[PDB]
Every structure is written in C-alpha cells, then in structure tokens.
Design a protein around this ligand. Structure first.
Ligand code: HEM
Ligand code: HEM
Ligand SMILES: CCN(CCc1ccc(NC(=N)c2cccs2)cc1)Cc1cccc(NC(=N)c2cccs2)c1
Ligand SMILES: CCN(CCc1ccc(NC(=N)c2cccs2)cc1)Cc1cccc(NC(=N)c2cccs2)c1
Ligand SMILES: C[C@H](O)[C@H](O)[C@H]1CNc2nc(N)[nH]c(=O)c2N1
Ligand SMILES: C[C@H](O)[C@H](O)[C@H]1CNc2nc(N)[nH]c(=O)c2N1
Ligand SMILES: [Cl-]
Ligand SMILES: [Cl-]
Lengths: 362, 362
C-alpha cells in the first residue's frame, strides 16, 4: 500500500510535469526507470528538473497563497547532498543571504533530503528561519506569543534569550540519529530588520516597533510525486497586512493598536469612533512606508490582489483549473475593496503542494 | 410526495417549536389535527403562536446574519387576513411606520398569506420596501445600479423616476388573479433619511450623500414547517459597514471612495498609500456619526460582532447547535479585529429559515 501510494503519485506527477516541460515523450521510459527503482529501493530520486518544477507546481497549488502569480520564477536550491549539521546550518545561513539579496528579496526554496520510510533525515524546529522569541512568565508577556513554546523548548537546550520584545531565535534542527536538536545563533549581519516609522506622524517611532525583512517558512512539508520533503524552507516577500494587520495588531500577538491610537492622537474609547479601524490603517501605512524607505521588498494588498487576478487569468489562459481558499485569500483589511471578496474559489487539494506536519516539540 | 414533504416538515417544526414553548404535551394532539387537515385540505394553518415563534426561529437559523442575538424579540405582525391590494399596500405602509418608530427602529416582520399549491397569493417585486432607483442609459449612470432592472420594470408600468441619485422606488406587487403588479408611491412622511456628514471634516457634506433609515427586506421566502410564506417583509437596523463599506463604496454601487478621498484631503494615486482603506474608514465613521446624530438606530461592526459572540454563548447555554456562514458574518472592514474571523462555523441549513426565491421580473 505504501509503495502503491508512491507509484500512483509518481505516475501522476511525472506525466503532468513532463507535459508542462514539453517532455511528454519521455514519460513512458522515465516511468519505467521509476517503477524499477521503487521495486528495488522502495523509493525513487527526482531529477533536478523534476524537483525544480515540482517546487514551482507546489507553490502554484497553494490555495491560501495570494502571491502565486510568480510561481514559475521560484529560485530552487537543491541541497539533497547534505549529511552533516554543519552543512545544514550553512545551507540555512546561505538561504537567508541569497533570498534577502540586500533587500531585493528573491523567492527561494532550499530542498533538503526527503523522508525515507517516513523517517526524517533533517528535522527543522523553527516555524520561520527568522522569528522573534516569546515569553509568558506569570503575567509578564514579552515578545511574540506565537513563539512561546518553541522559545521554551530552545531554553531547555542551553540557550537563553535576552527577553527583549525582539530576540531572534537561533536556528534549531535535529539530524537523523541524534536524540536532541542542535541550535545556532543567527549572525546578525545576515538579518535585515525594518524600524516602523510613519510618513506623516513623527511620534510613531515612539512605539519602537520593528519587523524582520524576510519571512522564511521552515516547517511545512513539500510533497512532490509521492516524495516527502519535510525539510524544505521557502520564502517570498511580505504582504503589508501580514505585519500591520496581524503580527503587530492581533491581541494574541503584539497587540499594538491601542498604542498606535495613542501616538496618532485619537481616542480609543468608543466602538463607534472606529478607532481600531483607523489605527489599523495608519499602522499598515507605516509598515509599507518603512519597508519601502529601507529598500526592502514588500507588497500592499491591493497590488497583491491585482497580481492574483492576473494569476487567475493565466490559469484560465493555460487551461489549468484554479484552486483557492477564499477565507485566506481575502486580506484582513478592506477585503471588499479587492476582487477576491466578490468571487468564489474551489478549495480542492492538488499535488504537488506544501502541507502542515506535526511539531517535533510540545 | 408534496403532501409528504409538508407532513414531514410539519412534524419536525411542531415538535421543536412546542418543545421551546414548554408546550411539549400538546404535540401529539396538534400533530393529529394537522394530519387530518392536510389529508382534507392539502395544507394546514399555523396558530398565532406557531407563526410567531416560527418567524423568530427562522431568524435564529439565518447563517449569514450577525444580528441574531435579538431573534426572540422580533415583532411579528400577522396579515394572513389580507385579500385586496389596498390591504396589502396599507399593511406595507404600516410596517414602515411601526418599524421606523421615529428612528428607534423595531425589528419587525409582516406575514402575508402563504403560497397554496406553490401559487402565490401576494407577490412582492421590491427587494426592499425602501430602496433607491437606478438608471443606466448609454454611459450615463444614475442612482443605485443594484436597482436598474427593477426600476426599468417599474417604468414599464407607467411610473417615472425623477432620475436623481436617490429616487425612492414605489411599492410594487401583484395579487393572485392579476396579470400585472400595481405600484404605489411611498408617502415621503413615512421615509426617514439620513444626510451623511462627518464629525470632524466639514467638507464631507459636499458629497451630498444620504441613505434611508430602515432596511426592510421584502423578497425572501419565510419557510415555517412546510408552509411557504413567499411574502413576509422583515427589517432590523443597519450595521454601519453595510452602508459605508458596501452600498456607498462598491464600484458596482455608488462608488464614492475617490470622492471621499478628495474631500478628506488625501491623494488617491498610489496603492501603497492605502487611500482606499483610509477613505473607507472615514466614510464609515461618517455613517455611524450621521445615524446617531439623527436619532436613527444603527450598530458598528465591533458592537455587532460583540453581540453575536453573546449569541454564540447563548446557543451553547441552551444546548442548541449553532450554524453560520463565516464568509458573510465577517465585516468588510477590519474583519480580523473581530472574534468571528478567528473561529469557524458550520454552514448547515436548518429550518425554519428565510430563503432566496426567483425574481418575478427580468
Ligand atoms: C512572493 C511573495 C509572496 C507573497 C506576497 C505571499 C503572500 C502570502 C500570504 C499573505 C499568505 C497568507 C499567510 C498568512 O496569513 O499567514 C500566503 C500563504 C502561503 N503562501 Fe504565499 N506569498 C508569497 C510567496 C510564496 C512562496 C514563494 C511560496 C512557496 C514556494 C508560498 C506558499 C504559500 C503557502 C504554502 C501558504 C499557506 C501557509 C499556511 O497554510 O499557513 N508563497 N502567501
Ligand atoms: C437587528 C438588526 C440586524 C442587523 C444589524 C443585522 C445584520 C445583518 C447583516 C449585516 C447581514 C448581511 C447583509 C448583507 O451583507 O447584505 C444580515 C443578513 C441577514 N439577516 Fe440580519 N440583521 C439584523 C436583523 C435581522 C432580522 C430582523 C432578520 C429577519 C427576521 C434578519 C435576517 C437576516 C437574513 C435572512 C440575512 C441574509 C440575507 C441574504 O442571504 O442575502 N436579520 N443581517
Ligand atoms: C504565522 C502565520 N503564517 C502561518 C500560519 C500558521 C501556520 C501553521 C500553524 N500551525 C500550528 N501548528 C498552530 C496553530 C496554532 C498555534 S500553532 C498555525 C498558523 C505564516 C506564513 C505562512 C505562509 C506565508 C507567509 N507569508 C509570506 N509572505 C511568506 C512566507 C514564506 C513564503 S511567503 C506567512
Ligand atoms: C443588498 C444586500 N443584501 C442582500 C444581498 C443579496 C440578496 C439577494 C441577491 N439575489 C439576486 N437575485 C442577485 C444577485 C446579483 C444581482 S441580483 C443578491 C444579493 C440586503 C440585505 C439582506 C439582509 C439584511 C440586510 N441588512 C440589514 N441590516 C437588514 C435588512 C432587513 C433586516 S436586517 C441587507
Ligand atoms: C477561522 C478562520 O478560517 C481562520 O482563523 C483564518 C481566517 N483567514 C485567514 N487568512 C489568513 N491569511 N491568515 C489567517 O491566519 C487566517 N485566519
Ligand atoms: C463570493 C463571496 O462569497 C460573496 O461575494 C460575499 C462575501 N461575503 C459577503 N458578506 C456579506 N455580508 N455581504 C456580501 O454581499 C458578501 N459577498
Ligand atoms: Cl509572518
Ligand atoms: Cl442594504
């Protein structure tokens, strides 16, 4: 049944992939090599081309992603060769560097060896490669609550955060054969951060807000033709609302709106004043302004929505069925101002794709 | 099969309804009377109590409605007695008057005779009892585009709009036996309207915006225990975003955001300025301010969301399953600022309920 799932998935991916790459006549032969390889080894190894296009396809199939227009230009780094934690660390360091690209962010994925018998070769603990720690000690909240459990797990392994609101978590990951993960402090010279200022309102800097430049998701499983790449960190750039409307605004995150309201000089007393909405808008304007001023790639939700419309059009133009999760595609501010809000999407799961997988801690 | 659908629906409604009304011991007897009545007449007639509670239940079951907390206080007017168009008109006029209640809006439903063999007794053409007309003549857009087809149909029947942006449509409805509907101009003394001004920004009145006080939906079918009340106009008060974020903001509606941006003194040139979002917020603040200043009931989306949370809690407290349509429950501005955004809802259809039905024109 396992070998059969793998074989079925492989036939479907190879046929589709080679169709897209104009390699349709190589399918029969390639499928044979695969079937022998599976019968002999219990698995199979992707060609560079297959792996690259699989990564792109997987992005194209991400129902929740609004930034899919640029799926075909994903920069793919093949690190299936790594065997050592030094090699894993250096590959991660490198991913940060080349993705960041001095602020001109390059959408990049680094692909590590896949699971074998469901056995991971490399198991990454970070949610993102760059993320802030979180502390909840008897009433005292510091930093990013989202990171509380990972931060605690890391503080078991001999690490210690400074307990500012913006401690960078180290890389933490475990190698097959090892009982505990290792951790490595990030070289600060690799991490670009952006101070949040506002274009009109001088006092906004009193909040002393900042965010990191590059969101690099490192806890999702890339699935390509039956092969499970549990360790395959990927990055794009931010949509502004992600920082301004969620990370800095959520009560369960940094919870800044009341402070935003105060520094922008409005009362936060009455629901009917719509102070939350007003604070949300200024904070999000601040975010967009700050990233642009700092030479760090970012997109506003109107432009993003506008780009995603082009993606919908391209799919139709290419005869590809379009899938999407409406509940995640709509931006958390002014959703009815985008076309997404006014149409529906089929939320069917298509592979290749990126999937959630169990956290290795907690 | 028809009589069987009716009988099944009736058993389910009577049992549930009488359970809620502490009348559980009357179910067996009441069900018998119903079964005889159906076998003899092909239908059955609701008691006043049944009809009233059915109307309330139907509201409680409206997955898309955020205002459901107040379901049990719905004011029900039983007009199953009407036979003439004069009687229908007067019942509609009256509904407007008592619902409006000088601005202190009373959630009210007026229930007309139900369909017999799927044959309507009274067929209402209006979407709402109070609504603005719409004209689209070679490039020239006037009024509310949503009302274009109904306005045209009405202008077949000898009526003529003045072609302002805010022409009130007359009541239009048809009686069983008649080939054409009749129409009646609304007495202006019955219609409260609100000029949109802004609390801080004097120039906002230059836009010369207004909206009507009371939204009275008059084109949905109320279904209670197998009985189809196709004609049963109902009203609540407005949630501010309905006017500020949709009716006045939608490009396919009044499309005012660029004009809002100009009178509030911001540029409407760059997506990254978030001028749409900023314009949305000021316009919605204007709406809330204007309705409150005029002594007309309205609710902001935070308070509404807050009330709907209490409704969720009540359902649980009463052992009632809760149903909801997440895509409609989230407000079109700052949705992530409400709890609704951060949970899920079962979108199952439960009866009694209000349903769409085919437009009689177009
Ligand atoms: C190029 C810029 C990109 C932008 C602006 C963008 C935007 C977004 C946003 C706003 C979300 C929702 C995130 C949230 O609410 O937490 C999202 C989700 C997602 N994006 Fe993208 N994205 C981009 C590139 C990419 C890339 C390069 C990949 C992978 C190759 C990707 C795959 C995904 C996936 C898998 C999700 C779903 C995550 C989940 O389910 O939690 N995106 N994207
Ligand atoms: C008391 C104040 C009320 C408020 C503030 C309220 C709020 C809302 C809002 C904002 C919507 C979405 C409308 C849209 O986006 O077009 C809605 C939908 C709805 N409401 Fe309510 N509502 C109220 C009372 C009522 C009453 C009295 C009824 C009926 C007895 C009702 C039944 C419904 C139904 C059936 C829908 C769905 C309409 C559709 O599918 O298009 N509501 N409500
Ligand atoms: C933090 C919010 N999301 C992920 C949301 C999420 C993911 C996974 C879980 N799973 C859980 N185990 C938990 C749920 C609740 C507590 S833990 C919960 C939430 C991060 C994210 C994902 C994908 C894209 C982006 N934004 C981006 N622009 C990109 C990053 C990388 C490429 S594009 C952000
Ligand atoms: C105009 C927007 N909605 C209804 C949305 C809608 C309904 C029905 C259709 N059906 C169609 N036939 C069409 C679709 C497209 C063109 S016509 C389309 C849209 C009006 C509405 C419905 C229910 C509640 C409210 N708001 C209110 N606060 C209340 C009114 C009455 C009681 S509460 C507003
Ligand atoms: C319950 C709800 O579906 C869920 O909380 C979603 C709503 N849509 C979202 N959309 C995005 N982009 N990100 C999120 O975290 C959420 N939360
Ligand atoms: C396609 C989408 O589901 C649809 O256009 C909905 C979204 N949610 C909505 N919610 C409300 N309250 N009103 C609407 O008109 C819509 N439009
Ligand atoms: Cl993030
Ligand atoms: Cl409306």
């Amino acid at each position: 049944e396992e070998k059969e799932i793998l074989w079925n998935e492989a036939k479907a991916f190879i046929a589709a992939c080679y169709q897209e790459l104009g390699k349709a006549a190589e399918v029969k032969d390639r499928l044979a090599d695969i079937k022998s390889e599976i019968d002999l080894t219990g698995s199979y190894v992707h060609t560079k081309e297959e792996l690259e296009h699989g990564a792109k396809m997987a992005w194209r199939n991400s129902n929740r992603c609004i930034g899919r227009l640029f799926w075909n230009s994903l920069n793919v780094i093949d690190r299936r060769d790594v065997r050592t934690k030094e090699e894993v660390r250096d590959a991660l360091f490198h991913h940060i560097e080349t993705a960041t690209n001095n602020g001109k962010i390059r959408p990049t994925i680094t692909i590590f060896p896949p699971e074998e018998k469901g056995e991971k070769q490399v198991e990454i603990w970070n949610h993102q490669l760059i993320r802030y720690a979180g502390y909840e000690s008897d009433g005292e909240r510091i930093g990013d609550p989202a990171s509380c459990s990972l931060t605690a797990a890391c503080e078991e392994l001999g690490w210690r955060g400074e307990r500012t609101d913006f401690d960078l978590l180290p890389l933490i990951f475990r190698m097959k054969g090892d009982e505990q993960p290792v951790w490595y402090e990030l070289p600060r010279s690799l991490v670009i951060e952006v101070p949040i200022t506002h274009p009109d309102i001088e006092a906004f800097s009193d909040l002393e807000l900042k965010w990191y430049g590059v969101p690099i998701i490192s806890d999702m499983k890339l699935e390509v033709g039956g092969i499970h790449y549990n360790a395959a960190p990927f990055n794009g750039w931010y949509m502004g609302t992600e920082i301004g409307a969620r990370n800095l605004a959520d009560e369960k995150r940094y919870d800044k709106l009341k402070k935003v309201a105060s520094v922008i000089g409005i009362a936060a007393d009455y629901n009917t004043d719509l102070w939350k909405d007003q604070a949300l808008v200024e904070l999000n304007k601040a975010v967009l302004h700050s990233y642009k001023k700092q030479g760090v790639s970012i997109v506003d939700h109107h432009t993003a929505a506008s780009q995603f419309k082009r993606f919908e059009e391209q799919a139709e133009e290419a005869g590809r069925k379009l899938t999407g999760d409406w509940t995640w595609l709509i931006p958390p501010i002014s959703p009815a101002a985008t076309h997404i809000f006014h149409r529906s999407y089929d939320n069917s799961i298509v592979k290749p794709n990126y999937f959630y997988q169990d956290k290795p801690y907690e």
